[PDB]
Amino acid sequence: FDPGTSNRNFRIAASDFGQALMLPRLYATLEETAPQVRVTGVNLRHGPLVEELESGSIDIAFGGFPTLSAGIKTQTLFREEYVCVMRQSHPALTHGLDLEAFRQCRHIIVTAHEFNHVHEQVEARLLELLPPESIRFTTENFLVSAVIAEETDVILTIPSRLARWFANRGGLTIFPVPIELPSIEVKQYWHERYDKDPGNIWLRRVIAKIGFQNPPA
Amino acid sequence: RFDPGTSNRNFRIAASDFGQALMLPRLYATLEETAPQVRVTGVNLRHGPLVEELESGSIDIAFGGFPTLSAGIKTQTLFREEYVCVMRQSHPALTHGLDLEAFRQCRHIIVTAHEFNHVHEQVEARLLELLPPESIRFTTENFLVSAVIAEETDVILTIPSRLARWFANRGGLTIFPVPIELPSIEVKQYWHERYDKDPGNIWLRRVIAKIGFQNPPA
Ligand SMILES: Oc1c(Cl)c(Cl)c(Cl)c(Cl)c1Cl
Ligand SMILES: Oc1c(Cl)c(Cl)c(Cl)c(Cl)c1Cl
Ligand SMILES: Oc1c(Cl)c(Cl)c(Cl)c(Cl)c1Cl
Ligand SMILES: Oc1c(Cl)c(Cl)c(Cl)c(Cl)c1Cl
């Protein structure tokens, strides 16, 4: 495998948020050292992710997938914490987001249990403490939810990197979540069968060298 | 029977990540004012026959362009869209003239749609035909993913003008015409015959049909 001449199309499975995080951080390496290598972001499916890595239909999975292990290698890239966002024109802005006021707001929830990524743990914690009538919107897409929160008076609970990126570019303001929530471990995953594949090795090597708390190159 | 004022029905709308972002903000006011506990769920498109999703009731309404949706399906046309191109303002090609050949030599991010059978597939096919394979750097199935990648890198993105405008308002992406002639798009709502007389379904359809899609959210 030669980056300088390869025209391989690498497929990375990740949430819309993960895709947006990853691809721009690969762009430098591509232009400088692998001008004909394509990167394709692929949405998470309802099916078994490991059976996608094995067939080689996906090269790499990026995110947090607790059901992955059997026949699957892993490397931990970083950890995330959650926060809430609301637009600056939201009535809750004045007095803040104590749990009681949190419950009286309207919410957009990102749903994940169908896709089996780590966000499902947050999804469950929110659903247990929130009156059913306070959930106005649901979506499977992080970016959909962020832009909806930008346009409407709904509270969104999300990974801190996603919140910061939108807050710095729009009317969203960041609040702690008045609910206990786990830390998140973000990893990259690949099947044993390709643990030795020169192309795979190269990509995951490049991914391991990315800085995930500074901007893209 | 369905009363929006008291219902706690969760409606499921199948749409691209872009249709979801267009639709849900424009339903918000109606829900708050006339159906405070009605929930709306944006559902991603899938490989499978969307018509079966509509048939079994797992989906209430499909929003977008779905040319394959025909038999046993009812439709209402909501608006027409046209394509444009975007690239970030710190992109070097944002000085010289961008005709066809300069378009073909730029780097591109493509939104792939054929696997999901929506109308964007027509544009995707024209792009794959037009462009040198080596000019295509990034592929994704999400419109919003491709828009933010284009804000952060020097790739060209060919997309619906509504989506280009929304992002352009942020100042990163600049709009210019696509240097080829692309099909005009008819955007519609679809529902299955089986639920044509279902009062909840009827209500959502009527609400969607009243939406002002040239204006911002109420
Ligand atoms: O897909 C995800 C990615 Cl990439 C990150 Cl970084 C986080 Cl924090 C979460 Cl929650 C998901 Cl689902
Ligand atoms: O770092 C990010 C980048 Cl590069 C993009 Cl494009 C987006 Cl959308 C987000 Cl959310 C983050 Cl955190
Ligand atoms: O899903 C779509 C929607 Cl809602 C619109 Cl408006 C357009 Cl123009 C296209 Cl191409 C798609 Cl795929
Ligand atoms: O009209 C739009 C609205 Cl309300 C949102 Cl939130 C987004 Cl992301 C886009 Cl693209 C459009 Cl066109």
Residue numbers in the entry:
A (entry chain C): 90 to 306
B (entry chain D): 89 to 306
Copied sentences from the primary study:
PcpR and TcpR belong to the LysR transcriptional regulator (LTTR) and are responsible for controlling the degradation of PCP and 2,4,6-TCP, respectively, although their precise mechanism of transcriptional control is not well defined. In general, the LysR family transcription factors consist of an N-terminal DNA-binding domain (DBD) and a C-terminal inducer-binding domain (IBD). The monomeric structure of the PcpR inducer-binding domain contains two nucleotide-binding (or Rossmann fold) motifs connected by a hinge region. The PcpR dimer was established by interactions between β-strands and α-helices from each monomer.
The complex structure of PcpR with PCP displayed the clear electron density for two bound PCP molecules located in two inducer binding cavities (IBC). The first cavity (IBC1) was located underneath a hinge region between two lobes of the inducer-binding domain and the nearby second cavity (IBC2) was rather exposed to the surface. In IBC1, the PCP molecule was confined in a relatively hydrophobic pocket formed by residues S104, F106, L110, F151, F167, Y171, H206, H208, F231, P248, and V275. In contrast, the imidazole ring of H206 was pushed away in the PCP complex structure and not involved in a hydrogen bond network probably due to steric adjustment for the bulkier PCP. The second binding cavity (IBC2), which was unique to the PCP complex, was located near the dimer interface between α1 of RDI and α9 of RDII. The pocket is formed from residues F106, L110, R114, W254 and P305. PCP interacts with the indole sidechain of W254 through π-stacking, and the oxyanion of PCP interacts electrostatically with the guanidinium sidechain of R114. Additionally, two residues from the adjacent monomer at the dimer interface, V236 and E240, contributed to the second PCP-binding cavity. The titration curve of PCP displayed a two-binding site mode, one tight and the other much weaker. The second binding site for PCP had a Kd2 = 70 µM, ΔH2 = −9.0 kcal/mol, and ΔS2 = −11.0 cal·mol−1·K−1. This second binding event observed in ITC measurements correlates well with observed PCP at IBC2 in our complex crystal structures.
